[PDB]
Amino acid sequence: NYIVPGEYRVAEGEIEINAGREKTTIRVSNTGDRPIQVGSHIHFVEVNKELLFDRAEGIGRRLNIPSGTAARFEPGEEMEVELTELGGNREVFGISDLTNGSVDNKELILQRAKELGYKGVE
Amino acid sequence: MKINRQQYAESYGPTVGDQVRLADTDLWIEVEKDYTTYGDEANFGGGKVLREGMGENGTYTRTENVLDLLLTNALILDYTGIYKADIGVKDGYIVGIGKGGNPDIMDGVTPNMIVGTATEVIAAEGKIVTAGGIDTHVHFINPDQVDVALANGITTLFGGGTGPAEGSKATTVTPGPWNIEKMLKSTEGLPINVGILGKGHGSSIAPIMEQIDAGAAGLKIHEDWGATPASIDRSLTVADEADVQVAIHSDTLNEAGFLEDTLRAINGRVIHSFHVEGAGGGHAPDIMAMAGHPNVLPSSTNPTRPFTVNTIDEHLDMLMVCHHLKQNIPSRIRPETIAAEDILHDLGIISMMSTDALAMGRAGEMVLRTWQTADKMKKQRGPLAEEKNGSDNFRAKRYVSKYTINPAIAQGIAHEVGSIEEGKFADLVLWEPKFFGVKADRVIKGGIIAYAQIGDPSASIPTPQPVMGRRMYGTVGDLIHDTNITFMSKSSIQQGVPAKLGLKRRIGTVKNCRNIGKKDMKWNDVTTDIDINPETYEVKVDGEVLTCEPVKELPMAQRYFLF
Amino acid sequence: MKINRQQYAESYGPTVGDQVRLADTDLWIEVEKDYTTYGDEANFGGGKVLREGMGENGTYTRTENVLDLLLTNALILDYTGIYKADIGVKDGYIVGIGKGGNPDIMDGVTPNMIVGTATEVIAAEGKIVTAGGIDTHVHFINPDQVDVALANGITTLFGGGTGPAEGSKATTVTPGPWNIEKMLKSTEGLPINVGILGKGHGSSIAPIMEQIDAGAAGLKIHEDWGATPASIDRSLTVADEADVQVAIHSDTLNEAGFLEDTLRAINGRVIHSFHVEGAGGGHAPDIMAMAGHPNVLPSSTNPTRPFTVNTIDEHLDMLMVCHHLKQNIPSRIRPETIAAEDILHDLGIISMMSTDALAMGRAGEMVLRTWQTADKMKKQRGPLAEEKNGSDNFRAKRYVSKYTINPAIAQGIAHEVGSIEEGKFADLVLWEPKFFGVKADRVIKGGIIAYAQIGDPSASIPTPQPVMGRRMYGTVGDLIHDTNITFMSKSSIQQGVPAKLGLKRRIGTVKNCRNIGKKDMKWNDVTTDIDINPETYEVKVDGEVLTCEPVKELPMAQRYFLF
Amino acid sequence: MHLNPAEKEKLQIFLASELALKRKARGLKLNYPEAVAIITSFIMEGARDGKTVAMLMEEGKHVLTRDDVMEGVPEMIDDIQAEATFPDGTKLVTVHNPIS
Amino acid sequence: MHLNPAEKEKLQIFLASELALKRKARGLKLNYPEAVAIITSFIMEGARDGKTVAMLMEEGKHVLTRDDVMEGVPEMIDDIQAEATFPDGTKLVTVHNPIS
Amino acid sequence: MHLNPAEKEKLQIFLASELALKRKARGLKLNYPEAVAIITSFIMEGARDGKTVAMLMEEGKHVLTRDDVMEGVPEMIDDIQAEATFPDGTKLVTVHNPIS
Ligand code: NI
Ligand code: NI
Ligand code: NI
Ligand code: NI
Ligand SMILES: [O]
Ligand SMILES: [O]
């Protein structure tokens, strides 16, 4: 009976994000001496060079976290993250210039990654 | 990974099935559907989604399906539905309602709603978004009235007047070619859409028609100019030829005829009946019977809305004042018709609200009183039969229609304004639910913000006190031209009146208002036999007695207002 | 006949060797030279010198070397010197700095500074005169911000925004051709010079370049749009081809790279680094190292300026608020870097001030905080080595440069504005010494007063209460067009954008900003190795530790301000 | 606060009424604008208190009397009108001949 | 006086706060704008007194309590922000959840 | 009320003076604008009282003394001027060096 102006009465239950897309768990280390936060929608293979992880497993993927949130890595911190698949056309342009086209081009992405010193390529 | 609903709603705004309270009323609206793809919601800020190569496309030029503006996560309340969507705007129009972002990486993106380099973002998560209000009973008496209207979410003023001249103070009339020209030029400086009514009075065609040709968007028949059978007939002949609307305030005195005489003069033609209840004017005591006819588009003005303990006293007050202006005031102010007017609104028999700004009505309280009325009817009658899920969605759509789509339809301007639909002009109002219908957050005119509740201009951020309504960049310099529409008759546009006067505003064409009726009033389309007892003023609808009582208190009042 | 110095200064303003206190600070400026001929000083009023046949020439038409306006006896404070001279203006530009009057009868009259029938007089004896301030970090969020900027002596706003849209509220960006067009038209109504930045974001050239062609004067890279290596690279390629400046707010999150990655993307190209200290945004914790590089033009925004006892608490406040807007806020606000920023200003390592108006900075406090900073450094470090005569002239020139000439140079507009030099536009601010840097006396825009602290408009004279800032005739009707400049890219001017939009303001060309660096920053030209310890945030300059402390009180504060 | 235009304007009426009441408290006969301000602000504060329109129409005739105002002021003021937010929304109060 | 734009605007906040305090003194539960005005003016007068930002952040949570205001008003006010001139220049005070 | 532009503006001076007087009453040394507001409003209320221009020119030198104001404020204020409606119409009062 107490009135809170504009209040919500939300329905029961939970919202599943990124439903029906493959998920993948990987370990990632911040080998740098400064903190790194990573947003929900950056193509994961194109993150800061000093993050060490299996770069191949970042291709075609992004963090499986609520839209608009970010994972945080303190200097030296190693931790697991869960990834989900990119959707739409599964193309990436710009950001770190590793892809600039289909995410299917795995060898091309890794060759560019390795040449520029993104840690964790084969 | 799942997000519970409470946290979901506080980050992205509510989703299907969630309900939101309108201000401090007991009305609840429920999200009917949501265009989003869960986990691909758009949002803007540090480490958020609308960033280059991510939710923002880095490839496409502005023509390539890219928006000028995305409102993210809006809860739309409209005659067309109550639902969650992103709203995309381009060239000052709504081009897409759906899901905005980058098809590079996101599923479910509406093809013409790409966020690109050219896109501005307004975050509407947690807000309600409605069409701008369309006020079709405006007296142009004091330019200060425009900000009053904007602050309560009104974006179009239709009416008449030359300022505080007695003609304009009594009637929504800009009389004659020269007054109309002068006010079209004045309009160049008013940050709101405008349409101007000429004097619907004359016994020859030409003195009337020449006002349409000069740029009027419609006519007003008013008793104070002689609401006689001749002026009614000539005005409707003019309107049928020019495709504009006529508004009527009929002969309260019953001097040349009773209500049946006015209907006979109208002769089945379309007409907008102003303040149909009659406190605002019209055949005493039975004008309100107008609202049962299929050719009548019926509006209320706002001071009778809704029926409260002070209503009669203040209207008796208002009648004393008219006597003191010595206006043939020794019947007029009737609790029976004002009470009934509440119920007729609820039943969909009166289709429209309007202000009567500065003549007998309040420029900034059309939207406010619409919701107070809906809330009072829920309290007294309970949920409408048509409701379900425990929401008030049906009543909310019937009421939102009264001040958005229905006035637009009646005026012949619904192709441009009056609803959140693709292809319509981007007149949009953002509301915090806590202020809904009371004080608008941001008023968008033609895709640019025109007015906003915003704080100290010297501060590090815009939220510190004092937060008040202020004109924004849409109103400054030449942008006032591009963000606002002057509505005009087809003949004045064909005859080149805009160029002849130097008008720089967008010119809207009035059309398709001779070929409509009551059935075209969205959610408010009821025709019926209204009986008003000549001796007791008792109101019947199809033989059934209508009865209500006034309330002592309203929501959307003393919790909000400093005076 | 001789006049002692005290009386001389109180009639004509000070002369060589005299010193003046800046407001209530401990800073003293000393007159370095004087262009006058003693006994032939110009002045205006009953029985004074500028009268026909005497100090006013009665012979010459306006073209014959005659001024439109003479400021008499001005004490100029400028990067070019602190000195006494008359300032002559014609066709809205400064044409002569020297000695004005009538060569008929006076010695030493600068040949093009004749007072004739066509000449207006402003008495500047006893005033300090500076260039108008150039604010290159403006968010266009609320039009009320313009008078705030004028009242503190700012005459040019460079930045971006469409009003209180979240994009504009976070970033100095007007995105895309249509938003840029709309804001150029809005600009027609704003009584201040303006230049607009587009969104410096994209992975193809064309979506970015099309904003320059539409009329943008520069670009802004902002982390909230994705400050990635791609957007940095594409923006600088665009800027190198279009000859406009790019401003950067880098990736605070270090998401795609650390500071060294951003420098690598920049690749030795010119860039303006915004709020270089980093509280305002940028690579945590070390962004401030930007300010050591020869290709970086570094500015501060104003809320960290200078370092005080409340600074951190209020910024911690500001971070809470960002968390509540839910902006990825569980490092950022560092006493070590804010303290160091004080000293870097004093050393000439940070070249520019700016506001960050309404996003994280105060529209009316760029000039105010510049002097508070200079004053704090004198109190803590003492006179700079370079000083002599006991004056603060060297520090005053280094500091005045930060908000006048250096922003102009960085933006590519110093041929028009940014200093009191012959050939430049007559944007001039008069200050009473007692109010210097706090509240401007009169702001001149293009040779006409635009804004003034002036009293009761109904009074017999203009000085009775209440004295407040008010817009003057320069802002009214069409004169607003002639007294203010819209700065635009060469390509938009070449493509006829002003005519295509109907712009009537003077159009300024942005140019010569790709071929500059740190060395071009007047009095503020230091390059060095800045080290920021990743663990302790300790700041070193060429291996030497930088350390300062906050102060409890500032001048130019509670003595002056009603709130 | 979210002040709308009328809320901002009406602060002025309260302010003028405070000024006038100080003038009355130091013994001055009040003038035309002072008198109007006092009675108007009385009405708006009355509505804020939750009184009815009918109550304020009566009470408004007894806020100032002729001995409180300068010669001619009673006859200059034929009516005073004010709109304010009552518990049941905005209503108009007109006080006819407030000072005899 | 040399009033700048903010100084002129902020006089309004002080005025609204005086109005609200009179309303509270005659026994009314305060509304949304009245409550905001009171707490805001408290902050600006506090800064004029020379208090610190930290002090005003604490004190601002104890200027009005729920029993001083109408139902729902505590929950309508999530924060109150004000900028004012401290002895060390202009600073921003934000008071989170000022009324419980 | 029929307020003309000056009447509306001058309400601000009275308001600033009320604010300043509250600040003085709680023990603060007054600043430049506060001091100006106090002396100006004193003059306008004086003229409303029916004092002469000569009286207000004298009295205006004794409304605030140096111990009432911050360091430097006496020397910042060389004159205070105000126009107001005397019983014989609008006149200008100038108070030279009001604070020593
Ligand atoms: Ni009518
Ligand atoms: Ni009307
Ligand atoms: Ni920034
Ligand atoms: Ni900024
Ligand atoms: O009306
Ligand atoms: O910023």
Ligand 5 pocket check for B359: Cβ under 6 Å:
yes
In chain A, which residues have their Cβ closer than 8 Å to the Cβ of C230?
93-97
Residue A48 amino acid letter: N
How far apart CA C426 and CA C89 sit, in angstroms, is 7
Provide the experimental method for this PDB entry: X-ray
In 3D, which of D61, D45, D49 has the Cα closest to residue D94?
D61
How far apart CA C106 and CA C41 sit, in angstroms, is 9
Ligand 5 pocket check for B345: Cβ under 6 Å:
no
Helices B229-242 and B206-214 cross at an angle (nearest 10°) of 40
Ligand 5 pocket check for B360: Cβ under 6 Å:
yes
Ligand 5 pocket check for B280: Cβ under 6 Å:
yes
Distance B460 CA to ligand 4 centre (A): 10
Number of Cβ within a 10 Å radius of residue B498:
18
Helix, coil or strand: residue F80: strand
Residues F51 and F33: beta-carbon distance below 8 Å: no
Chain A residue with Cα closest to B15 = A10
How far apart CA B88 and CA B396 sit, in angstroms, is 24
- B132-418+477-563 in CATH: which number? 3.20.20.140
List, as one string, the DSSP characters of B234-291: HHHHHHHHHT-EEEEE--TT-SS--HHHHHHHHTT--EEESSTTSTTSSSTTTGGGGG
Asked if B554's CB is within 8 angstroms of D2's CB, the reply is no
C376's CB contacts (< 8 A; 6+ apart) are C306, C307, C342, C551, C554
In chain D, which residues have their Cβ closer than 8 Å to the Cβ of E37?
1
- At the top level of CATH, the class of F2-100 is alpha beta
Mutate to test the interface with C, among E1, E4, E7, E95 (most CBs of C within 10 A): E4
Q: D30: buried, middle or exposed (CB in 10 Å: 19+, 13-18, 0-12)?
A: buried
How far apart CA B251 and CA B281 sit, in angstroms, is 8
Catalytic site positions of B:
323
Helical H runs in B270-392? 311-324, 335-347, 366-381
How far apart CA B29 and CA B10 sit, in angstroms, is 17
Helical H runs in C328-454? 335-347, 366-381, 393-403, 405-411
The tally of CA atoms less than 13 A away on the side-chain side of residue C396 is: 29
How far apart CA B541 and CA B545 sit, in angstroms, is 7
List, as one string, the DSSP characters of B447-492: TEEEEEEE--TTSSSS-SSPPEEEE-GGGSTTHHHHT-EEEE-HHH
Residue E22 near chain F (CB below 8 Å): no
Residues B195 and B486: beta-carbon distance below 8 Å: yes
How far apart CA E10 and CA B458 sit, in angstroms, is 11
Length of chain E as a residue count? 100
Residues C35 and C97: beta-carbon distance below 8 Å: yes
Tell me if C396 is assigned to a ligand binding site.
Answer: no
What are the pocket residues of ligand 6 if the criterion is a CB atom closer than 6 Å to any ligand atom?
Answer: C 249, 275, 280-281, 356, 359-360
| Domain C1-131+419-476 in CATH 2.30.40.10 | yes
Residue B270 amino acid letter: V
How far apart CA C454 and CA C467 sit, in angstroms, is 5
Q: A91 to chain B nearest CA, in Å?
A: 5
Task: Pull the structure tokens for residue B362.
Answer: 């309040």
B178's CB contacts (< 8 A; 6+ apart) are none
- A1-122 in CATH: which number? 2.10.150.10
In chain C, which residues have their Cβ closer than 8 Å to the Cβ of E98?
none
Mutate to test the interface with C, among B429, B473, B482, B505 (most CBs of C within 10 A): B473
Domain residue ranges of chain B, discontinuous segments joined by +: 1-131+419-476, 132-418+477-563
Element (H, E) at F95: strand F89-96
In units of Å, what resolution does this entry have? 1.9
Q: A57: buried, middle or exposed (CB in 10 Å: 19+, 13-18, 0-12)?
A: middle
Ligand 5 pocket check for B356: Cβ under 6 Å:
yes
The DSSP call for residue C361 is S
In chain C, which residues have their Cβ closer than 8 Å to the Cβ of F92?
459-461, 464
Q: Of C323, C345, C415, C481, which residue is the catalytic one?
A: C323
Backbone Cα Rg of chain D:
13
Distance B301 CA to ligand 5 centre (A): 8
Specify the residue for token string 């758009």: B42
Length of chain C as a residue count? 563
How many separate helices (H) and strands (E) can be counted in chain C? 15, 23
